[PDB]
Enzyme design. Sequence first.
Site: not given
Lengths: 157, 157, 157, 157, 157, 157, 157, 157, 157, 157, 157, 157, 157
Positions: A50, A79-80, A104, A139
Amino acid sequence: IYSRLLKDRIIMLGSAIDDNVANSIVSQLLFLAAEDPEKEISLYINSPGGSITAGMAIYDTMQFIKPKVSTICIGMAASMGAFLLAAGEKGKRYALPNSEVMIHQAAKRILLLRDKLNKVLAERTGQPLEVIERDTDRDNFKSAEEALEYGLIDKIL
Amino acid sequence: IYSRLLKDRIIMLGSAIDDNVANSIVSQLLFLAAEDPEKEISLYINSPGGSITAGMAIYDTMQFIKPKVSTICIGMAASMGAFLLAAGEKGKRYALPNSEVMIHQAAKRILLLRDKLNKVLAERTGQPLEVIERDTDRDNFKSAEEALEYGLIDKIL
Amino acid sequence: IYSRLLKDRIIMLGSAIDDNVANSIVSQLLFLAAEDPEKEISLYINSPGGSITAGMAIYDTMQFIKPKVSTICIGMAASMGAFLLAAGEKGKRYALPNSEVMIHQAAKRILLLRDKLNKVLAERTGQPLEVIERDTDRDNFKSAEEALEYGLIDKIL
Amino acid sequence: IYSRLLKDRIIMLGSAIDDNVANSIVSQLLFLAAEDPEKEISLYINSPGGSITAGMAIYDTMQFIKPKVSTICIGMAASMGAFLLAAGEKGKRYALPNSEVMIHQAAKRILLLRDKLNKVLAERTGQPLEVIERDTDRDNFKSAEEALEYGLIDKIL
Amino acid sequence: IYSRLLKDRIIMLGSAIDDNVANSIVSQLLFLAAEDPEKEISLYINSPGGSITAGMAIYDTMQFIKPKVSTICIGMAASMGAFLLAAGEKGKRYALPNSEVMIHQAAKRILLLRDKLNKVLAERTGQPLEVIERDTDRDNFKSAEEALEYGLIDKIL
Amino acid sequence: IYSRLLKDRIIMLGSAIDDNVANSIVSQLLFLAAEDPEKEISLYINSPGGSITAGMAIYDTMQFIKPKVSTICIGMAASMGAFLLAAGEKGKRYALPNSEVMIHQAAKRILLLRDKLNKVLAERTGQPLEVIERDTDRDNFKSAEEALEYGLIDKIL
Amino acid sequence: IYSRLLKDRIIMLGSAIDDNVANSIVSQLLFLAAEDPEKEISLYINSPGGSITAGMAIYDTMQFIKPKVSTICIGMAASMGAFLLAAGEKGKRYALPNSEVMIHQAAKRILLLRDKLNKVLAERTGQPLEVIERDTDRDNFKSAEEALEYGLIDKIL
Amino acid sequence: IYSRLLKDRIIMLGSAIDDNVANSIVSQLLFLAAEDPEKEISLYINSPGGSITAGMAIYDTMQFIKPKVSTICIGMAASMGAFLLAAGEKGKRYALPNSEVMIHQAAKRILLLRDKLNKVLAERTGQPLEVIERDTDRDNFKSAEEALEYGLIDKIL
Amino acid sequence: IYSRLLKDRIIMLGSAIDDNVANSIVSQLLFLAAEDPEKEISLYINSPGGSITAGMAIYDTMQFIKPKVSTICIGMAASMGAFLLAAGEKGKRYALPNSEVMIHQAAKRILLLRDKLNKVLAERTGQPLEVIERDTDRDNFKSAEEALEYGLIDKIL
Amino acid sequence: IYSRLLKDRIIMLGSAIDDNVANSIVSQLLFLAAEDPEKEISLYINSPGGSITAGMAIYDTMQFIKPKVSTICIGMAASMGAFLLAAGEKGKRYALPNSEVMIHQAAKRILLLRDKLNKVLAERTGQPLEVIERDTDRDNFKSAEEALEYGLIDKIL
Amino acid sequence: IYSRLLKDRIIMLGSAIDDNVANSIVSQLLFLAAEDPEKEISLYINSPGGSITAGMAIYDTMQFIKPKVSTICIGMAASMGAFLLAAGEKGKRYALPNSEVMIHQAAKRILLLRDKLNKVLAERTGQPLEVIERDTDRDNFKSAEEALEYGLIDKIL
Amino acid sequence: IYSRLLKDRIIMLGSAIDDNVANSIVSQLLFLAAEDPEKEISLYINSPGGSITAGMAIYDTMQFIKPKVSTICIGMAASMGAFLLAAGEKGKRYALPNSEVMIHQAAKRILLLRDKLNKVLAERTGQPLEVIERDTDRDNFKSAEEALEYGLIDKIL
Amino acid sequence: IYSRLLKDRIIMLGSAIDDNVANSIVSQLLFLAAEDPEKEISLYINSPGGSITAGMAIYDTMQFIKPKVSTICIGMAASMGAFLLAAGEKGKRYALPNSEVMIHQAAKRILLLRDKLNKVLAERTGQPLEVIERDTDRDNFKSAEEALEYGLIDKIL
């Protein structure tokens, strides 16, 4: 079908993250508050990722109401959704034993966010910022178990 | 139409396999889960195949809940549906005498699953492991009876 | 314009044959199943033809649902769509005196069905096979009466 | 609209003639059958024409049922609804004094319907088949009154 | 919006004139007709024009049924559509003091209507053929008042 | 949702600003008047911006009524939504501790509004004028706290 | 929305002016009319402009009924809406203190309206026709207050 | 590409047969027809199918020209065009040792033509006509040498 | 460049293999024989995949014509290009030290064709037969180096 | 391709007849006007149909010019261009021994021209009149010598 | 314009890297081979991204031909172009004092190649190996200046 | 062709009205009047209709220049354009014995110009004025012969 | 004209600034670079806007090459691009007495650039840094005249 889910205070979130959907969840959360103040609630996730702007948009609201919030992950989590994952109460953040998580990432504005963001996530766990940064730009797909040591989650079933 | 189906407790799955439809099935599985626990459901299939990420996105769930899950094949059952076929209860995995069934198939992670997958069916089937890799990398369409001996399934009418 | 069909249970099959419709018909057949054990259905037809997969996909289903099935033809009866026609019960097959019925037609598989197919349809009457491979490879429109002698039909109004 | 249109046992046929619409009428004609076998119905028309195949598809069906069928024409009717017009009961085929009903019109069977078809219209009244083929091959717009001498029609208003 | 429109027995005719809409009106007129004949009807108009084949598709209908018909005009009463204006009962054809009206306007039969048509509208008023062809081939817009001398109109508020 | 939330006397405004949406809000604002005008209401916001014309369209409407209006901001608030933010009552308007705002932007008609628009916003905050126009043309993303000393908002949790 | 809206004697007119909407509105006038010729109606406006053919299409109607009509403007109002603005009773034509108006803007028939139109707009207010005409091709945007001198309106709250 | 291709008297025919290309294929023939009666010409093929009416547009054309013609085949000689494979001289019709070939297919004319065509092989190839009809109705492919025993082909390579 | 290419007597073939492109190829080869059928020719590749029926369009031409052919590989060669990689003068087939290569894949026809290939490569490679199918039916990328010891290639660079 | 055709004094006409193409053909006809009016030409046909208004665009043109013209047919001669078949001289209108040819078809003038044509061909064929309309209004295909009896054609090949 | 560039030996490469574009480059490359050994073509870049598999295709070719090459960068150099930047002589790789170059990125193969790249740059840069593999996966845009000290660039301007 | 159309001073104008032919003209009028304004320039037509304002772009242009112009017709002298038929030298306006020529049709301007043209043709024909007013507002076709008696045409062929 | 535009060393730049166009403009500069390093060059503008990252692709190049550059403006000199106005020789920057010029506008690096430009113009113009900064950050469309004294230009016409 999404409707009949909602009758016992459950939600889904799996497609992607824009502003359009962002208005839906907030609204969903707001309807569910004014029917009862205390009926517990959960949240299920299977996300690709996102933007950044709504990540606070939801965290602020989740930190706002009368009742509490629980969270669950499924397989992939970005990540979100990760930040959303470690947002309910401390011992109500379950997951599954096949699941991956990752971390990230109109200029002077954003630099407040990437710093403000880390302040949260490095305080629910105790882990300091030096651990965060080199493991935030890179990552590396963690797993279910090893994530627990990192301080994202309490007890897989 | 589907409104009446679920009043009997049955699901369909026959088009193809993406994340989008994958997001749907979970919810249906979650719908009945809160309606009743003593409602062992069925599941019918007519599959061309699918991706890998949703493959271990369902067996994760199907193993958990209080109810149990039978399953049935029709016609052509692909790699993914096959892993779903020999995934429910021991003695509730039926099929038909016309049923084609076969078995076949970011980067630092996907290579881990197809060793995790093969770690499954060797237990469910009892079969050894190296026999899998010469059979899984190849393409040999089997049928009702001859596929039974591997131990995917348990009965037929 | 479907609700009052299924009360006074009746089905229609009129456009063409793909996998999409193939998943629809099975479900309707499954609708009646868990609704009543006795509700002898019928089935009207007007086809251009179809593929080979769904053909035997259905004929197996028609036998799993022992509650009996009747069949009727209209106008043009195609290829494998018409193989359904004699597949119903022996004395509940009918047609009309203006109707045609025409008969003709991932490698090692398909060559079996065209044997398995003729294996069935020659046993309903007692015709040999080589009589079929003169008739099935060719194309010759028959009709009500002249097609009866091959032994598809049992009666007519 | 088409609901309350239909609750008083009346139908339309106005657009054109394909297989799609052809599959629709048959169903309506079958809807009314199981609701009452003696509720003798009507049928209105405003047609440009059509193909050859469904012409028989309807006429046989009209003949299959118990109840009776009345027919009425409006304005135009080319040589596919005209066949329907002179197909109901003899004493119930009405029309209007502004109406133009003139008629003009794989291989091995197509030639048969054009003979089977002419069999009807000539046997309906008693006209020979040369007078049929003389004026059928061509086109010349007849009217309300002059049509009556052929024997298509009995009444008028 | 329609559900309440057709209630009180009122219709509208507003956009243009094809065959598609032509079937809609007749059906409505028949729907009302299947209920109480003594439910006196009205009609409102605002048209740009139309074809001719449907012009004499309605006056036929309007003239048969037992219930009487009233007509009213708005704005621009163009060809055909205007021909209906004078086609209702003689003592109800009202109109408005702002509204214009224009009355201008296969290859063996279409020619008949333009003679059939003029014969009607001249017999309605008693205004001989001289006045017709002088004014019909041409284009001259007339108002409320000056139209009354032609006998189209019978009164106004 | 909309029927479900609006029954609870709540509105949303999330996407962007045109004329069409402008007609919707007023409509919502007017539907809610007659139903218990003593119900104080609210208004939630998430805006990218918009045009100038509707800006007055809502503010004048907000005063015309008898009821009263509270306002809440979320995250990003644009130039016009800010004007909306300072539209309601005095100590009945709030925001969130992670949000921000931004305040910047057929000839003479436009030009007057920049004054009248600026006129209000200065006569609400105990501020002078050159403080405004200087900060208006520029672009400086402010926060929760510093806004409070700017007399926009107060009473935050 | 419009359903539970339209009960309480209210309409909206927001987008633009064509023929399609012109027919839709008159219907709304007529539905409230024959349903209840006592309901004191109102009206709200927001427009960019329109054609001329529909201006008279309404004003003739607005007076034709038995009940009365009130009219209100917001913000902007165009040439056509202006004529509509001065359509209601003399003492029920309000507006808002942030709004403006404008007064500005086949052959032989259209020209008559520009003269017929001005005749109306002067006799409703009293001003000489030339001064009315004299600013009827001159765009000069007026306000609430200076409009009242013309007698366009009668009162603002 | 083909500016130099027509030079050398060479053609290709590789896609399909419809009305467009047939007219085009012609124009290639007779641009060369004017130049010489002795300059020989070649012709290459690769067809997936073929029409019927267009087929009797070329065999016609190919005769009564001055120049002499030769033909060569490739891959899958679909139908009709194939008829062209047997169209030149008895010793100018070569092929390749991996090439397959098959032979297959208003009313008053179409049924006439596929009988006329058979009489064309009352001149060329596998003499006993009654056996020309024996085969073209069948679907069974052939090889090069498996086809030489007729006389379709005369000098392999 | 492309007219300059053929004057250099060099080809590229890098997108895909369907019916369309295959006809472009065959033209180019013989066209180099058009200018001179005694001239050594090159052929380069970079293919992602390949068809099957079109593959037996080219092998013959490479053997039919007079001139000799050399072949060179780049990057990824799917199933078909490998057949072409081993199709030319023996000591004229080269490659690069990065060029991965793999080898992979009506019913009475297709199953005959993929026996002709197994019949071949043992002659070109000099290897056994059932060890071909032992690797041809699976998927395992063979590098440049391990391809030389096979026999596909014989002068690397 | 076509600029070389025109330099050969040859035309083609093979697709259809509309407004667009007719404007081209006259110019092709008229390009030779600027050239010598000597050096006679040819004209080839293959039409599926034809219009009527454009038919009387060309016939006159052939007579206005100074050059002399011949005509040759192919395959099918839909209608209207066909007529062009008999447009040149009684001895320069050839054909082929497969070329089937058929005949077929504002009010005040469209009627007038299909009468004008029937007045013509009796001057070219020499046959009577009322046998022409007797035969042109029907539909029936005639071959070469079936037309040589008339005079459409004069030297076969 | 590009057609003139090749005469002044130069390439531009500025959009992206996918399958289509890569084939142009190789072709653009090798045409210039024989025209001069000491051609020493320039090569300019400005890319926003880059693929992975297509990248290797170029490196071999660039390190295959007899001619030499020099390379020059502009601004935004994504992942792959960096590898491509260094691909040249030790002293013919220039840049600008304004640019920003970055470094970034079948499982048995795709994962295997970035090993080969990390295997390389320590030979070109002279830097170590495993320091690459930790600093290559992150994201930190290095300038022209601080990128010299590694060894990517050998002279500036 | 199209320059070779312009070659030897010839135009065509046969589709519809467009704004672009003067562009095609002024080369001629300028280059030829530079060469010789007396040579044989021509102009041909075949139009279905045209506009009114564009028509007064051309008639002026045909008189501003020195050279002389001739005009020739084909069939449909649709409308406006035709005016151009009588817009050249009074003895160079020919036609054909097949043509159905006819003649037909802000506000302060358009009502001016259809009067302006009516003021003209009496100068070109010789007839009166107000007889034109009655003969163009109507719609009736006139042939060649019926048109010579007026004066539109002066030498037939 | 565009090759002729390139002749005598002239460019235009009038639409926009995106990725595609920037590469052409580069190449346009580069083709001209080869012929002489001394033949001066012109450059004209009329831009509505401008990007930022593409802007630092050109300023270097215009400083890189050997030839000089002179620049001239027209009307709407937007953001970024304009920067190029003052990006040539100290005394070859002309303009027109009618034009309006404006000056306006990854996170870790983009913040470097809009400061990097502010580093320049004190050098290119000579005015202190902060003045440049504030003026540059507001919207204040300056003229030819008042924008001279900032130093952007030193001659007019």
